[PDB]
Structure formats: structure tokens, C-alpha cells
């Protein structure tokens, strides 16, 4: 799902894909996810 | 052998089940419910779950959720009962309840079942898209900073509308004086009076409609500039660039490339077309189409630092996707050549730092981000890059929060930073503060697609707290 940001440099648009990946792991690495 | 009589009834209900006689299977399951000792939670939950399966084939989704609910009370981690209730709630349009059930399913499965994660991803997009639509209706638009506006127009050279002055003339003077909030008004006066600067005002008003996050008002202006064949081809090519980018923003890759292709055909030497299309080709991982556009940018801008920094990164992604370590090091050394040839091109360092992070050189990537702070100290996105680096590198959530907070001090209107801070608060377990940061980015997001993604992060956070209560 390409989340394109308006008026951003290429390096910033590349960081969106990095942020999406970190958000997936963040929800899998929460206290509730490990304690269950 | 009172339990053997319950399984005997369950096993005859299974034979009515396989024969398609679900009503008669339901009665046998009901008989098995009665004969099961209340001390046997697992076996009793099995019988309720089997009856929910029979209700599911009759597509009586209400009874499915009812039997799965009773089965969970006896077996709280019965994953098959939880997942079947999640499917039932989806059919009943109980999207929040479906999200909570499938959230518990994915956690119990260790996020190892693609079937459960696809259902959670499906309901998360729908919930976030709904709230983004209703919020985008009556959202008040915010004018971005002058630094963002000048950086946006500086990414164009053939747009006309950004050129200096040698209705629309008054709008061009409000722009030269950085009084942006009154540009849309003066552009409408040209369009309503149909002056000689009608196409320019039509294009300039659409641009600031986009700049304030009103893509729905920019679309008719862009459509009209493109329909005017008498108008300057530079104005139509620029309008096609912006309508194509909006298409890609709305998950329309085919219509996006059609607008960009038409812009290249009607204006073949417009370097803005090849510059902005190639950036999208990289995001779409269409690398060989990207280097072709970036090579055209170098041909049309042989002294542009950014053009050669672009092409160097495009060559890197080509080596990164093909997985030849000989070509990877060839493009990696190409970055060191670009930064030596253009030592004050900050994006050259940032594109290098991305390739270094992709290839585990975090310490040197942090140095390249430090160089960007030297050249451009007021660029908040570099501090977001350093924060994202600290997460992939050392997982230092405290130093990562400080760097993301640093970007907010420079630009408090940076929705990307607030989204990163909320992501960190999810990883620390602070769900209420995470929703807090996601909402501040929602009121700052520039597109409905960005807002839907943020609303999805809120529903995922709220769903986890509800799962946490049990």
C-alpha cells in the first residue's frame, strides 16, 4: 500500500516503507502480545 | 460413561453434518451439550463450536457468534472458536468486535497464521477508511510552512506558476510576499472573470488546494487545465504530474502512469515529468523504468546534483533487488563518488544513509544523517531519520523518542514525526499515549489515505487494550 506523501524528498518517501514495517513489529512486540 | 454419551451424540451430529443435514446435526450437538458434564470445559466448548459450524453453513451468523461466545467462556484461548466468531462478526458488520477477536487470534498464534492476519488487515483498512472519510468532510485545512511551500515549488522548473513576476497577478504577489492564505481567493477571481491568466490561476489554485490537503477541490481544476488544449503545454504537463501523483495517492497506479505518460508525450523535454515519474517508479520498485527516467533527468540537467544522486540510488536499488554483491558494492562506492562530487547535496547523504541502513552500516548511516544536520540544521525530517535509525539499530526507545521529539521542536506540523512517536509508545506498551500521538498526526495529515492509515493504528491500539482486559 504505497502511502505517497506530498512535497517530500525521495529519502522521506522511502522512510514510509520503513515506518510501516516498524509499526507491524511494534504491535507484535507489545506487553499484551507476549504475555498471552 | 456419561461423557461417552456426549461424544456419541457429537459423532452422529458429525455424520448429519457431512450429509448436509445441518438442522439434524444441530439437534445432535444440542443433545451433546446437555449430556456433557459441566466439569469438562474443553469437551463442552468443542460441542458449542461444532454447533456454530452448522449454523455457519446455514449462514445464520447471529447463532454462530452466540455459540462461539459460549465456547470461549469454557475455553478462553480456543483459537478456532475465536476466529469463527471473528468471521461471524464480519458478516454482521461488527467490525470492532471482529477486530478484537482476530487480534486475540493472531496473538495466540504468534502472528504465524496468514489467514488470521489477512482478516485483521482487511477489517483494519475498512475501519480506518470509514473514519478518514467522515473526518475529511469537515476538517479545517492548514497552510503548510513557507519552507515546505518553497521546497515543493523548487522541485519544479517548468511549471510557470512559480516563476517570478517580471487576480492572478495579485496572487503571484501574495506568493512572493509569502501571504499564501489569500492566493486561492485571487486565483478564483481570474477563473470567474476568465482573464488571460486563467489556466495559470486554474493550476495555481489547484496546487494550493493540494497544499492545504483539499484534493477534492484540486481535482476539478486539474481536470479543467488538462481539457484546455489551447493552454500552454507546460501548464498541462504540470497539471498531469499533479493529477497523476493524486491518482497514486488514491491507490490508482494505472491512471497515475497514464497521466505521467501523457505528460511526457505532449511535452517530451519537460524534465519535471521525468523527475517526478522516476521517484514514483522507485517507490513502486520498477527500477529499470526509474533509471531510464533518472538518466533522462541527467541528460536534461547535466549539472544537477540531485539528478545524479537520484540515478546513483536507482542503480543501487537495481543491485539490491538482483542480489549480486559485486554490483551492490559497485553502486555503494557510487554513493561515495556522488557525495564527493556534490558535498553540499544533503539528499545525496540521505540516499546513501538509506542504502547503508539497508546493508547494516548503521554507524556510518548515522554519520550521513549528521552531515545533513550540518548542511541543513532546520530540516526536521533528518531527526526523524535518526530516530527511525535508533529503532532498527539499537532499539533504544528512549533516545529514539528524544530524536523524534527534536523534529517536532523544529516542525510541529510534521505528521510523520507524530506517527513515529506513537509507534514507539506502542512498542513500550503505552497505548493511551500512542493513540494520543496518532490523533495529533490525524489532524495534521495531508491526504485521506494518510488519515485512514493513522485511524487504523488507533483501532489496532484500542483493540489491543480491549483484548488486554481479558
XYZ file of C-alpha atoms in Angstrom:
506
model
C 0.000 0.000 0.000
C 2.016 2.959 -1.313
C 1.376 5.849 1.086
C 2.660 8.735 -1.049
C 3.462 11.955 0.818
C 3.054 15.291 -0.961
C 6.089 17.508 -1.470
C 8.605 15.152 0.115
C 12.123 14.156 -0.950
C 12.758 10.607 -2.104
C 14.539 9.676 1.133
C 11.449 10.684 3.126
C 9.075 8.661 0.937
C 11.434 5.697 1.344
C 11.128 6.095 5.122
C 7.365 5.477 4.931
C 8.013 1.858 3.946
C 10.420 1.652 6.892
C 7.823 3.141 9.245
C 5.151 0.683 8.066
C 7.485 -2.223 8.838
C 8.329 -0.847 12.286
C 4.626 -0.392 13.064
C 3.875 -4.050 12.310
C 6.653 -5.245 14.619
C 5.637 -2.739 17.308
C 2.166 -4.270 17.655
C 3.663 -7.779 17.665
C 6.150 -6.664 20.360
C 3.744 -5.182 22.915
C 3.305 -6.398 26.517
C -0.144 -7.815 25.723
C 1.173 -9.768 22.721
C 3.932 -11.530 24.676
C 2.049 -12.138 27.948
C -0.783 -14.038 26.230
C -19.626 -43.184 30.812
C -21.754 -40.035 30.740
C -19.064 -38.290 28.683
C -19.031 -41.135 26.146
C -22.728 -40.458 25.525
C -21.966 -36.805 24.758
C -19.244 -37.665 22.242
C -21.582 -40.300 20.794
C -24.163 -37.585 20.117
C -21.431 -35.309 18.757
C -20.229 -38.058 16.417
C -23.704 -38.623 14.984
C -24.087 -34.874 14.535
C -20.858 -35.005 12.540
C -22.428 -37.593 10.227
C -25.507 -35.431 9.699
C -23.056 -32.563 9.159
C -21.200 -34.358 6.358
C -24.510 -35.320 4.717
C -25.590 -31.669 4.569
C -28.353 -32.206 7.160
C -27.338 -29.290 9.353
C -30.662 -28.921 11.191
C -30.439 -32.541 12.343
C -26.750 -32.067 13.159
C -27.705 -29.050 15.290
C -30.066 -31.190 17.375
C -27.386 -33.833 17.960
C -24.933 -31.135 19.049
C -27.619 -29.726 21.356
C -28.073 -33.235 22.760
C -24.303 -33.432 23.260
C -24.369 -30.074 25.074
C -26.852 -31.485 27.589
C -25.037 -34.784 28.205
C -21.595 -33.249 28.777
C -20.552 -32.873 32.431
C -20.118 -29.224 33.351
C -16.662 -30.109 34.706
C -15.364 -30.698 31.147
C -14.728 -27.213 29.765
C -12.810 -28.311 26.654
C -15.240 -31.014 25.521
C -18.223 -28.732 26.146
C -16.576 -25.892 24.215
C -15.970 -28.361 21.374
C -19.682 -29.171 21.183
C -20.679 -25.493 21.095
C -18.061 -24.833 18.408
C -19.347 -27.747 16.322
C -22.885 -26.358 16.514
C -21.570 -22.944 15.462
C -20.099 -24.635 12.382
C -23.542 -25.961 11.442
C -25.081 -22.514 11.930
C -22.321 -21.105 9.709
C -23.295 -23.275 6.734
C -26.895 -22.127 7.131
C -25.357 -18.616 7.231
C -27.191 -17.787 10.474
C -24.356 -15.568 11.648
C -26.127 -14.451 14.831
C -26.305 -18.004 16.184
C -22.686 -18.562 15.098
C -21.455 -15.719 17.305
C -23.684 -16.904 20.158
C -22.309 -20.458 20.229
C -18.715 -19.324 19.716
C -19.173 -16.924 22.644
C -20.277 -19.705 24.996
C -17.417 -21.885 23.747
C -14.901 -19.151 24.601
C -16.265 -18.895 28.155
C -15.305 -22.546 28.693
C -12.056 -22.385 26.672
C -10.860 -18.754 26.662
C -7.958 -19.499 24.285
C -9.952 -21.709 21.872
C -8.457 -20.221 18.713
C -10.904 -21.912 16.329
C -13.879 -20.564 18.284
C -12.408 -17.054 18.443
C -11.604 -17.000 14.719
C -15.034 -18.328 13.745
C -16.666 -15.617 15.856
C -14.429 -13.067 14.121
C -15.755 -14.225 10.749
C -19.302 -14.117 12.128
C -18.918 -10.526 13.336
C -17.569 -9.571 9.902
C -20.773 -10.846 8.287
C -22.863 -8.942 10.860
C -20.901 -5.697 10.281
C -19.471 -5.860 13.807
C -16.097 -4.627 12.630
C -14.813 -3.532 16.043
C -15.854 -6.860 17.570
C -14.350 -8.716 14.604
C -11.090 -6.796 15.041
C -10.907 -7.650 18.750
C -11.495 -11.367 18.150
C -8.966 -11.637 15.315
C -6.498 -9.616 17.407
C -6.640 -12.271 20.125
C -6.341 -14.965 17.443
C -3.153 -13.503 15.962
C -1.567 -13.086 19.404
C -2.313 -16.683 20.409
C -0.965 -17.922 17.057
C 2.227 -15.875 17.388
C 1.248 -13.980 14.216
C 2.143 -17.141 12.270
C -1.206 -17.701 10.501
C -1.605 -15.687 7.301
C -5.352 -16.382 7.307
C -5.850 -14.568 10.620
C -3.558 -11.667 9.707
C -5.315 -11.099 6.374
C -8.648 -10.816 8.192
C -7.213 -8.359 10.725
C -5.599 -6.321 7.945
C -8.868 -6.308 5.992
C -11.009 -5.035 8.874
C -8.349 -2.501 9.906
C -8.316 -0.853 6.473
C -12.120 -0.679 6.378
C -12.400 0.874 9.848
C -9.671 3.431 9.166
C -11.051 4.291 5.730
C -14.518 4.961 7.163
C -13.298 7.345 9.869
C -10.933 9.091 7.451
C -13.850 9.753 5.094
C -16.119 11.280 7.745
C -13.262 13.294 9.264
C -12.081 14.597 5.869
C -15.581 16.026 5.261
C -15.459 18.813 7.845
C -11.719 19.043 8.505
C -10.301 22.522 8.564
C -7.305 22.896 6.215
C -3.945 24.164 7.459
C -1.482 26.104 5.336
C 1.978 24.475 5.474
C 5.075 26.455 6.356
C 6.785 28.703 3.787
C 9.823 26.406 3.916
C 7.655 23.472 2.831
C 5.946 25.537 0.124
C 9.208 26.827 -1.356
C 10.723 23.335 -1.216
C 7.678 21.965 -3.048
C 7.848 24.508 -5.877
C 11.641 24.201 -6.106
C 11.093 20.578 -7.187
C 9.673 22.068 -10.415
C 11.325 24.193 -13.091
C 8.741 24.113 -15.922
C 5.620 24.945 -14.017
C 5.227 28.596 -14.882
C 3.111 29.272 -11.880
C 6.118 29.506 -9.631
C 8.071 31.907 -11.782
C 8.813 35.391 -10.648
C 6.910 38.417 -11.817
C 8.666 40.493 -14.467
C -6.342 38.455 -9.966
C -3.557 36.024 -10.816
C -1.005 38.845 -10.789
C -2.195 39.743 -7.289
C -1.994 36.064 -6.319
C 1.587 35.940 -7.613
C 2.424 38.927 -5.388
C 0.805 37.410 -2.297
C 3.021 34.410 -3.085
C 6.186 36.493 -3.470
C 5.337 38.020 -0.067
C 4.588 34.593 1.500
C 0.953 35.512 2.208
C -0.302 32.162 0.995
C -3.738 32.079 2.663
C -5.120 34.601 0.132
C -3.739 33.031 -3.060
C -6.765 30.768 -3.576
C -9.078 33.792 -3.422
C -7.249 35.802 -6.087
C -6.992 32.760 -8.363
C -10.768 32.269 -8.267
C -11.215 35.869 -9.437
C -9.307 35.065 -12.636
C -11.295 31.874 -13.236
C -14.583 33.660 -12.549
C -13.564 36.562 -14.808
C -11.833 34.284 -17.364
C -8.810 36.534 -17.801
C -5.681 35.869 -19.817
C -4.067 34.178 -16.786
C -6.984 31.748 -16.483
C -5.056 28.500 -16.979
C -2.270 29.680 -14.663
C -4.730 30.628 -11.917
C -6.567 27.347 -12.505
C -3.276 25.494 -11.988
C -2.092 27.655 -9.079
C -5.397 27.295 -7.217
C -5.324 23.515 -7.663
C -1.765 23.440 -6.308
C -2.690 25.231 -3.079
C -5.825 23.103 -2.799
C -3.378 20.193 -2.681
C -1.056 22.106 -0.345
C -3.828 22.556 2.246
C -4.980 18.944 1.902
C -8.074 19.604 -0.236
C -7.504 17.110 -3.031
C -11.249 17.016 -3.757
C -11.227 20.683 -4.789
C -7.959 20.359 -6.736
C -9.253 17.534 -8.958
C -11.794 19.643 -10.934
C -9.188 22.359 -11.539
C -6.594 19.813 -12.717
C -9.245 18.152 -14.924
C -10.067 21.532 -16.464
C -6.463 22.577 -17.149
C -5.942 19.249 -18.927
C -9.111 19.652 -21.020
C -7.918 23.033 -22.373
C -5.829 22.085 -25.411
C -5.233 25.738 -26.327
C -3.482 26.278 -22.988
C 0.295 26.168 -22.647
C 1.674 22.629 -22.781
C 3.819 23.384 -19.725
C 0.636 24.040 -17.743
C -0.992 20.794 -18.912
C 2.160 18.749 -18.287
C 2.425 20.179 -14.772
C -1.268 19.518 -14.127
C -0.834 15.941 -15.358
C 2.083 15.454 -12.956
C -0.084 16.583 -10.045
C -3.177 14.624 -11.086
C -1.043 11.523 -11.607
C 0.504 11.858 -8.165
C -3.003 12.232 -6.696
C -4.035 9.064 -8.551
C -1.105 7.203 -6.994
C -2.130 8.682 -3.631
C -5.600 7.141 -4.090
C -4.109 3.714 -4.970
C -4.621 4.194 -8.723
C -1.294 3.124 -10.281
C -2.762 2.620 -13.761
C -4.407 6.046 -14.011
C -1.305 7.594 -12.435
C 1.031 6.225 -15.106
C -1.417 7.222 -17.855
C -1.271 10.864 -16.746
C 2.525 10.766 -16.447
C 2.855 9.098 -19.854
C 0.594 11.713 -21.451
C 2.671 14.455 -19.812
C 5.843 13.005 -21.335
C 4.253 12.671 -24.786
C 2.842 16.200 -25.049
C 5.989 17.786 -23.516
C 8.910 15.487 -24.343
C 11.708 17.702 -22.945
C 9.959 18.560 -19.656
C 12.431 17.367 -17.024
C 9.797 17.731 -14.286
C 7.867 14.834 -15.843
C 10.890 12.528 -15.782
C 11.949 13.726 -12.326
C 8.616 13.131 -10.593
C 7.704 9.958 -12.505
C 11.058 8.351 -11.717
C 10.575 8.976 -8.000
C 7.294 7.060 -8.203
C 8.954 4.273 -10.202
C 11.387 3.759 -7.311
C 8.556 3.616 -4.764
C 6.843 1.026 -6.988
C 10.114 -0.979 -7.248
C 10.034 -0.526 -11.046
C 13.759 0.090 -11.010
C 14.735 -0.190 -14.676
C 11.945 2.250 -15.522
C 13.286 4.560 -12.803
C 16.897 4.640 -14.021
C 15.549 5.367 -17.507
C 13.716 8.436 -16.190
C 16.644 9.465 -13.985
C 19.012 9.092 -16.940
C 16.752 11.464 -18.878
C 16.932 13.896 -15.950
C 20.736 13.841 -16.110
C 20.585 14.328 -19.882
C 18.291 17.340 -19.409
C 20.022 18.590 -16.222
C 23.699 17.642 -16.625
C 24.828 19.855 -13.713
C 22.027 18.946 -11.273
C 23.414 17.422 -8.075
C 20.093 15.792 -7.179
C 19.707 14.205 -10.624
C 22.962 12.264 -10.256
C 22.164 11.444 -6.625
C 18.817 10.061 -7.816
C 20.383 7.897 -10.522
C 23.043 6.623 -8.113
C 20.310 5.446 -5.741
C 18.366 3.977 -8.670
C 21.439 1.953 -9.644
C 21.669 0.787 -6.026
C 18.077 -0.469 -5.888
C 18.772 -2.389 -9.100
C 21.716 -4.145 -7.451
C 19.763 -4.580 -4.204
C 16.890 -6.350 -5.966
C 19.076 -8.647 -8.076
C 21.273 -9.654 -5.123
C 24.716 -9.560 -6.834
C 27.217 -8.450 -4.199
C 29.586 -7.309 -6.965
C 27.012 -4.853 -8.322
C 25.953 -3.867 -4.791
C 29.452 -2.710 -3.858
C 29.710 -1.028 -7.267
C 26.695 1.166 -6.511
C 27.728 1.610 -2.867
C 31.039 3.129 -3.969
C 28.985 5.212 -6.405
C 27.428 6.973 -3.418
C 30.838 7.974 -2.046
C 31.619 9.381 -5.502
C 28.376 11.385 -5.597
C 28.920 12.945 -2.168
C 32.476 13.904 -3.126
C 31.336 15.452 -6.415
C 28.465 17.283 -4.659
C 29.460 17.687 -0.992
C 26.570 20.038 -0.107
C 23.727 17.944 -1.571
C 22.013 16.783 1.614
C 19.768 14.302 -0.206
C 22.886 12.608 -1.565
C 23.896 11.818 2.010
C 20.345 10.784 2.930
C 20.039 8.421 -0.038
C 23.419 6.957 0.929
C 22.349 6.560 4.564
C 19.279 4.645 3.373
C 21.483 2.254 1.391
C 23.817 1.916 4.383
C 20.874 1.081 6.661
C 19.626 -1.453 4.103
C 23.098 -3.062 4.286
C 23.608 -2.873 8.111
C 26.075 0.075 8.166
C 24.167 1.921 10.878
C 27.065 3.836 12.433
C 28.110 5.303 9.092
C 24.455 5.952 8.233
C 24.135 7.996 11.423
C 27.174 9.982 10.281
C 25.496 10.794 6.960
C 22.421 11.978 8.859
C 24.756 14.115 10.982
C 26.138 15.694 7.801
C 22.590 16.611 6.767
C 22.192 18.442 10.079
C 25.425 20.312 9.323
C 24.248 21.423 5.879
C 20.565 21.908 6.796
C 20.087 22.345 10.563
C 16.407 23.324 10.211
C 15.403 20.105 8.400
C 13.235 18.174 10.854
C 12.974 15.038 8.700
C 16.650 14.234 9.301
C 15.909 13.917 13.025
C 13.044 11.576 12.130
C 15.551 9.572 10.084
C 17.923 9.387 13.058
C 15.022 8.317 15.267
C 13.928 5.581 12.867
C 17.593 4.547 12.742
C 17.790 4.156 16.534
C 14.829 1.754 16.346
C 16.224 -0.516 13.609
C 19.728 -0.315 15.116
C 19.863 -0.438 18.927
C 16.103 -0.487 19.730
C 16.849 2.439 22.078
C 13.290 3.672 22.530
C 14.400 6.488 24.855
C 16.985 8.014 22.517
C 14.587 7.361 19.644
C 11.857 9.341 21.392
C 14.260 12.230 22.025
C 15.252 12.448 18.353
C 11.649 12.303 17.133
C 10.745 14.943 19.718
C 13.612 17.020 18.291
C 11.962 17.009 14.862
C 8.742 18.287 16.446
C 10.568 21.247 18.010
C 11.722 22.273 14.526
C 8.445 21.475 12.726
C 5.447 20.906 14.993
C 3.357 20.440 11.819
C 5.198 17.234 10.829
C 2.636 14.428 10.925
C 5.357 11.892 10.081
C 7.092 12.579 13.401
C 3.913 12.218 15.476
C 3.220 8.879 13.779
C 6.719 7.661 14.656
C 6.298 8.727 18.288
C 3.013 6.836 18.545
C 4.674 3.757 17.062
C 7.316 3.943 19.797
C 4.666 4.284 22.515
C 3.041 1.117 21.151
C 6.337 -0.762 21.468
C 6.767 0.473 25.049
C 3.183 -0.557 25.849
C 1.798 2.964 26.398
C -1.340 2.500 24.318
C -3.140 5.623 25.564
C -0.189 7.895 24.770
C 0.176 6.097 21.431
C -3.418 6.918 20.475
C -2.636 10.461 21.645
C 0.214 10.821 19.145
C -1.779 9.180 16.344
C -4.633 11.678 16.779
C -2.274 14.656 16.584
C -0.988 13.279 13.277
C -4.563 12.727 12.051
C -5.398 16.418 12.485
C -2.172 17.114 10.546
C -2.293 14.541 7.729
C -2.478 15.975 4.218
C -4.420 13.227 2.406
C -7.358 10.990 3.211
C -5.172 7.935 2.564
C -2.649 9.050 5.192
C -5.521 9.723 7.594
C -7.021 6.264 7.040
C -3.692 4.627 7.880
C -3.461 6.626 11.113
C -7.048 5.803 12.103
C -6.198 2.128 11.543
C -3.314 2.446 14.005
C -5.776 3.851 16.550
C -8.249 0.985 16.138
C -5.410 -1.540 16.387
C -4.249 0.112 19.614
C -7.748 0.301 21.115
C -8.437 -3.310 20.120
C -5.333 -4.480 21.986
C -6.366 -2.773 25.229
C -9.765 -4.471 24.975
C -8.006 -7.804 24.477
C -5.766 -6.891 27.428
C -8.772 -6.544 29.749
C -9.306 -10.299 29.354
